[PDB]
Curated annotation (Swiss-Prot), chain B:
It comes from Homo sapiens (Human). Belongs to the AAA ATPase family. Induction: Up-regulated in breast, uterus, colon, ovary, and stomach tumors. Induced in breast cancer cells overexpressing NCOA3 or treated with estrogen. Down-regulated in 5-fluorouracil-resistant derivatives of the colon cancer cell line HCT 116. It comes from the Eukaryota. The chain holds residues 422 to 1390 of 1390 of the full protein. ATP binds at G46, P47, P48, G49, T50, G51, K52, T53. Interacts with ESR1 and NCOA3 and these interactions are enhanced by estradiol. Interacts with acetylated lysine residues on histone H1.4, H2A, H2B and H3 (in vitro). This is ATPase family AAA domain-containing protein 2. The gene is ATAD2.
Amino acid sequence: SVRFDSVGGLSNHIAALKEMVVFPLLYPEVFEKFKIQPPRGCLFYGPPGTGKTLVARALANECSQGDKRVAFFMRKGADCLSKWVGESERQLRLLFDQAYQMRPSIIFFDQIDGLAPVRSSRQDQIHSSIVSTLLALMDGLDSRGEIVVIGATNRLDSIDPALRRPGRFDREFLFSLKEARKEILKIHTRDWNPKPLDTFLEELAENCVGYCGADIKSICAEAALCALRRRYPQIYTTSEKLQLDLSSINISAKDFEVAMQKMIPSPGQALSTVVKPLLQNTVDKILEALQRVFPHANACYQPMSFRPRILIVGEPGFGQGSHLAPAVIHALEKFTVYTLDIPVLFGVSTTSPEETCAQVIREAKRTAPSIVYVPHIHVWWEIVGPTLKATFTTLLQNIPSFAPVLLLATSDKPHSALPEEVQELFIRDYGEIFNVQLPDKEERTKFFEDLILKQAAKPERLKNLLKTVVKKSQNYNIFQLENLYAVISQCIYRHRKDHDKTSLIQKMEQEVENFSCS
Amino acid sequence: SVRFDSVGGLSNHIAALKEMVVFPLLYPEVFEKFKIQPPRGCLFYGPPGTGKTLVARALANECSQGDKRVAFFMRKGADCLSKWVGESERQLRLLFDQAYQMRPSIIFFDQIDGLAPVRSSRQDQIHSSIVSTLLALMDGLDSRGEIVVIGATNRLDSIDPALRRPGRFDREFLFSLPDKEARKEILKIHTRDWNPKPLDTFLEELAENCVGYCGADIKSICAEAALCALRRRYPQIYTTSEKLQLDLSSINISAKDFEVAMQKMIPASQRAVTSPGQALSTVVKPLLQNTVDKILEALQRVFPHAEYQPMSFRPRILIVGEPGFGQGSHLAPAVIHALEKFTVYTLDIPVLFGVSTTSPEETCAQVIREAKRTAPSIVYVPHIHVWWEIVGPTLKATFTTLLQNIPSFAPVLLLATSDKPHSALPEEVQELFIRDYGEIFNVQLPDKEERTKFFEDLILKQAAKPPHERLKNLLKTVVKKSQNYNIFQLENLYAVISQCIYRHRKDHDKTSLIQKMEQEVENFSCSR
Ligand SMILES: Nc1ncnc2c1ncn2[C@@H]1O[C@H](COP(=O)(O)OP(=O)(O)OP(=O)(O)O)[C@@H](O)[C@H]1O
Ligand SMILES: Nc1ncnc2c1ncn2[C@@H]1O[C@H](COP(=O)(O)OP(=O)(O)OP(=O)(O)O)[C@@H](O)[C@H]1O
């Protein structure tokens, strides 16, 4: 039922899997020209929840539909278990021949852990002969095509070590657990009478942090199930269905949100729904400046730079590391990010801090371009020992000059107050230091539109009130603004069940005048 | 016998279970359009003695004598094992087929771990064969409709994960320890058929005390008290070989019997651990209940999540009082105990250093991650004036940087107490607590009425029982002369007066010790 249309996000995995597995089986005479000798053993491995067997079934559909030029047999290495001496043994030679009498073919082996476990002194002589003669079945009945052994498992070490030898089972395909999620939401709701809004589904996928595929459909089914709970609360404690129209179970804005809150669900995090219209301008500005310094976000017509470096400096309480920098990291996605802070350096024992400080830089060198994050450099410099500072400096210096790896750091004290070793590390004469500024008047004006007023009247003079709140908030930092918002929004809850107005507005207007934060 | 009546306190897993057993048999239409396909395997788990077998017995009786007809089939741990090589796996299939031929039926398995262990290569192969042949015919349950198999176990871990899969066992029910309202129902249930029915106010007065008990513990004390009353009424029976004569009507159960019965018993869950929470003793309650109330209402004002959705923003608070004001030894345990149902993780010197082989930063890491996992949660840090001047700078930096990562609106409270005032407190800590948040409380000395009530029980009520105005004068002068004392000194004076009262237990006339009482009352001197 799936022909590469119920798969979301896997734009690059498909190209690799088809080119090195199916195409050599789809076009075997081509590789006779150069003698590539493609491997005869392939695997699907990764964390659970990646949907490994469905890909094999899709390959079966692709190969079977047509002229039957390449085939596929579906097999499981966990239901192929026979409690007899050698009866499950014939399954592979017949299968490696049944798929060979009608070759080419791809044979899937789900959970080979049971059919071919680790033969040992505790395992049955049955399974001992099974595994021995079984590896004899595969390494002997291969090496000329056109059978490519594809298997799946949850753990890589759950395989008999004699299987993974030269000239035997070799290849491994990494399946991992957000760009896939838009495609997933598009696909899995292909036939829905209450078709949700595209922004509705995008918010759904945004709020489904940590889910991998199956639970993505599970939440949708659960949302429908609780929709018929909420629209029809009388389903409990009622007689047989007498009059129920099964069309008012339509999913609206609040249905999935009440559905999401009924189960438990990196230094990059976008702003909240309340914070976005306050710092979005500054995030865009810093992104633009970074574009200017860092062009990656002999021969010409190729981007090049000289040691990408940048420092965020702002007065404490300006949210330069509390809200800005993780947001910038989130905005500059599709690049590897690697932090270096105290709980990641001292948070693991059985290792010297020097032992991990080299691994991050080495592996970020491997995957250039990469991002290294060092928050609160003004305090991180005074916690490490004398050797760590020197090791950090030498590791940073050993980078190539034209390597497009960016150093991102944030600070609280002004640049002129830092230790001198930091000072002769940034080039303020260049574009390497960015300043954070207080929000302007429009942002503060638009920060209070929702509560004043789009929900208070939900079942004048307050406008003067409104401007007074702004008339005092010219020079308050982010934390004071947000705490003020929370304290005002509390009173709105305080009189939910008071239809009579002019008494709640009195208490709001007297609390705002009473709010002293000098 | 029992029909869903004696089972009280849950009231929620019964509704979802008749929907499993009865509703599909009566309403085969709601499951038609939506393709509901209700699940067929339930997995009872939880700490022992909280149910999960009483429910099975109630269900068995309900289906035996409810809507005819449903059959009950049950095993005891591991009975499929036989001596021969073929009957070990054949009896299972035989009884399973016998159950299928008797549709409809219900299958009950208890002690799953005794028949379905965790498969591995470090154990015998016969168990591997039996678990495989068990999960074989279980997977083919869709074809053999109207067959439901349920399981009762105690250890979640000791089950092979291969069975805990959609297709075999996709549903689990957790049976945890009961709460106050549920305990009241349990006490009402187990004393139901008592001829002098006790009054309800006594029942929840008692149920306030029971904090760690379960079903079995609650049941047992109702027999312990009866035997204690039996002993109290007729203490001539034990040292006797021959039978005697009893009237059977002089026996009556009083509150003292319950008190002494609870004295010797120990809660089942606390036979290997002591929780970091205590409630005020009876002698102290009329001296700090008001302040516990005021702290509770203030924290409710700042942290309203304990009253569509209340909003909170990094709730914090710090109780500050003089050294002798009992802020770290009485008030904080009271606050932690009055806010039940909240998982609280503590953090003090016997926690960071009280454990070996683990550097303090590691322990802080597990603590903070597990406090974020189950929110709302409480972090306990007592004596912050001392916890801070002993730890290394690295630990301070880790502690400060690891709580800045929290979601702003999460209902996570920081709880701490101090002995020095806020101003003298280290400045680099004072940024965590800001006055406009209302995070600062000052414990004050109790007023005149509180002392008057505190000493009112000793005099003049205890000094009146055989084995008046002068006592009023003595109370007056004592209440006057203790107007500048802290909690420790007050309870010390209480103790010395009580001891002097004890020392004249056998004096048959008063007025011989009133002069004593007054004389050591003057002999008291503390001066802080
Ligand atoms: N990434 C995914 N995309 C789509 N469907 C998925 C995904 N992951 C899981 N599913 C669905 O949930 C089911 C559970 O996956 P599956 O059991 O095959 O994975 P697993 O956790 O490795 O378990 P096991 O190997 O024991 O079967 C799949 O059969 C499929 O229906
Ligand atoms: N909610 C309850 N109401 C009344 N009695 C209860 C309750 N929970 C437990 N009990 C008492 O506990 C007794 C036995 O408990 P039960 O066998 O149900 O526990 P279990 O956790 O399944 O046992 P175990 O783990 O030891 O196998 C019951 O006979 C009953 O007296």
